[PDB]
Design a protein around this ligand. Structure first.
Ligand SMILES: [Mg+2]
Ligand SMILES: [Mg+2]
Ligand SMILES: [Zn+2]
Lengths: 135, 72, 99, 97, 220
RNA sequence: ACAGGUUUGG
């Protein structure tokens, strides 16, 4: 018939050995496909033990240097007037234009944080965006 | 036909119901194996002994392992 | 070829940062007798209540404005190995595509 | 070789921590007007954390100052001084529904 | 019989036998909210190697490995449909139950989006009929059911030796799925993209099988 | 020790 065992291993590891033993005298059609293109991980059963102690997950947080600049704009003026449009792939927000102006002014050899921060807000008035400083 | 089975354990299990009181039930362990490395085991529990043996034999084929045997 | 690392940095979700009080636009995709399932576009759809002003102007496919509060309501309780996800989002109605 | 990879930095959007009403303040045992804003006007029970909302430091010092002022003779125990009844309500408890 | 084995052995010698690489791209997967997952608190422990990072609580999936696993899954799906394999889309989710059934109808494969019965795949000779033919491939569009627990078919496939290709979110358990794909199954665009990918993978496979049979008829 | 019998509605 077959092997209804789960914790021993994978379906391939349970069918190939059975066919080698000679009980299953008919080869499944998917076995040739599995031998031709095996997956990256063998589907072995693994029990999700809970993580105790000082151990922590191996995932690393996502943070960029642009976030350190966006924090300044979000603490100074808050949310921009032009609402975000999550459907447009190339949508550029007010804070995105601000951090672009910031990183552009950084190349001019400006090391003062105030010089890099207020000049971008003053230059955005040339493009003509409206800023609402939260006080 | 090449499979051979053996009974490993036989036990008269009792259960206390509401009306019949003691309910004698036979539970047995049955192992199957052909001799080429493929084998398995199962548990058959029923009321009659001949029925428990048959259920164990029919359920032992579904659970089969393969034992890696050095030089067989 | 543009890999994932480059296309993720230019995502609007990355530019938005935290989801606390952000002005977004969402298109309604389903209509109930009084509730509105608005998909702001990030992960989930927020459920809002139909206001008394221009309540008839809200139809299937209309784009509206929202102030996003939370992206996905998840929290932990006693004896829960994981969190209890609401499978929704938290947002309030302000306008309907003021333009 | 990619330059758009996330960098292991701190959280820039980390909001400041919430402060208690007396955070970075100087509590005393003689300001009966200050200590009365945390006791019940009808009985004199000292309100707890769930009603006041004070962080771990000032909560105990307020209780110590109240217990000192109730024995030294600064503030009555069985009730609240009615002269300090017109003080602004700081607690989060509503009696008259 | 000597000529029929060549039809089966022909696609096994080539890697992209059906040209499935043009069906999608990393950008096509990014534009469908696939790279987005649940919060960090709902993270299953077996998703740390399948996650790219965490953007303020919300985890992000690595689209490179996503696309690689998707290529492998689509290849394995196309080969089964070419070899006349019964493909069952099992997905218990009361948001796209209509879309999944319509995709299965347009593909000619079977679907299951209602209450999954207990002895369906195990006690099949009593639930379906005297002697039935079990699905040769099981495709999961939502691994977790309405109780946020792993589905029953994802275990029954491994218990009956049936291959499984499943979309696993950040809270799913890919320990038993044969060809898992780390993605998002909560977004309408994501589920539409996966449905269309499987649609074209089944359509091209069936059409190429018909063309190979037509060529075999002229072979002699 | 290659072990087996013996508690209990089980
Ligand atoms: Mg999900
Ligand atoms: Mg005893
Ligand atoms: Zn304090």
């Amino acid at each position: 018939a077959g092997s209804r065992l789960e914790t021993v291993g994978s379906i391939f590891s349970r069918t190939r050995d059975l066919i080698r033993a000679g009980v299953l005298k008919e080869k499944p059609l998917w076995l040739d496909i599995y031998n031709a293109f095996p997956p990256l991980r063998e589907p072995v059963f693994r029990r999700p033990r809970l993580r105790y102690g000082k151990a922590k997950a191996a995932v690393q947080d996502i943070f960029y240097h642009e976030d350190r600049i966006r924090a300044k704009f979000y603490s100074a003026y808050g949310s921009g007037p032009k609402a975000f449009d999550l459907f447009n792939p190339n949508f550029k927000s007010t804070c995105q234009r601000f951090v672009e102006k910031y990183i552009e002014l950084q190349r001019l050899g400006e090391t003062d944080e105030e010089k890099l921060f207020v000049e971008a807000g003053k230059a955005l008035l040339a493009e003509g965006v409206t800023l609402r400083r939260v006080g | 036909d090449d499979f051979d089975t053996r009974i490993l354990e036989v036990r008269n299990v009792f259960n206390m119901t509401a009306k019949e009181g003691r309910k004698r039930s036979v539970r047995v362990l049955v192992a199957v194996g052909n001799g080429k490395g493929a084998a398995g085991f199962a548990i058959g529990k029923a009321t009659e002994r001949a029925d428990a043996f048959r259920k164990a034999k029919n359920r032992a084929v579904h659970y089969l392992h393969y034992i890696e045997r050095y030089e067989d | 070829v543009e890999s994932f690392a480059s296309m993720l940095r230019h995502s609007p979700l990355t530019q938005m940062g935290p989801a606390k009080n952000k002005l977004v636009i969402g298109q309604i995709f389903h209509i109930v007798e009084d509730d509105l399932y608005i998909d702001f576009g990030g992960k989930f759809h927020c459920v809002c209540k139909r206001p008394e002003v221009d309540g008839e102007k809200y139809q299937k496919g209309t784009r509206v404005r929202l102030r996003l509060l939370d992206l996905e309501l998840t929290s932990r309780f006693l004896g829960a190995t994981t969190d209890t996800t609401i499978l929704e989002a938290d947002a309030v109605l302000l306008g309907l595509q003021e333009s | 070789s990619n330059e758009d990879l996330p960098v292991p930095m701190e959280n820039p959007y980390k909001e400041p921590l919430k402060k208690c009403i007396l955070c970075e303040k100087h509590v005393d045992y003689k300001n009966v007007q200050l200590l009365s804003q945390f006791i019940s006007p009808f009985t004199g029970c000292i309100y707890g954390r769930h009603i006041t909302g004070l962080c771990g430091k000032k909560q105990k010092e307020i209780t110590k100052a109240i217990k000192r002022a109730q024995i030294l003779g600064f503030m009555p125990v069985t009730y609240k001084d009615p002269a300090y009844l017109k003080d602004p309500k700081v607690c989060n408890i509503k009696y008259r529904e | 019989n000597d000529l029929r084995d060549r039809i089966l052995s022909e696609p096994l010698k080539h890697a992209d036998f059906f040209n499935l690489k043009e069906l999608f791209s990393v950008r096509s997967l990014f534009d469908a909210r696939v790279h987005l997952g649940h919060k960090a608190g709902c993270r299953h422990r077996f998703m740390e190697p399948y996650l790219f990072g965490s953007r303020l609580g919300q985890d992000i999936i690595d689209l490179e490995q996503t696309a690689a696993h998707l290529q492998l899954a689509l290849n394995f799906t196309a080969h089964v449909a070419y070899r006349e394999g019964i493909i069952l889309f099992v997905s218990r989710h009361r948001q796209f139950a209509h879309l999944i059934e319509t995709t299965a109808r347009d593909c000619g494969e079977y679907a299951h989006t209602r209450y999954f019965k207990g002895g369906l795949l195990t006690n099949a000779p009593l639930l379906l009929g005297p002697g039935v033919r079990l699905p040769d491939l099981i495709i999961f569009l939502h691994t977790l059911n309405n109780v946020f627990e792993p589905h029953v078919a994802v275990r029954d496939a491994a218990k009956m030796n049936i291959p499984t290709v499943g979309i696993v979110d950040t809270n799913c358990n890919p320990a038993l799925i044969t060809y898992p794909v780390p993605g998002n199954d909560d977004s309408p665009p994501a589920v539409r993209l996966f449905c269309r990918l499987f649609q074209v993978a089944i359509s091209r496979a069936k059409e190429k099988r018909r063309q190979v049979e037509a060529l075999y008829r002229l072979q002699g």
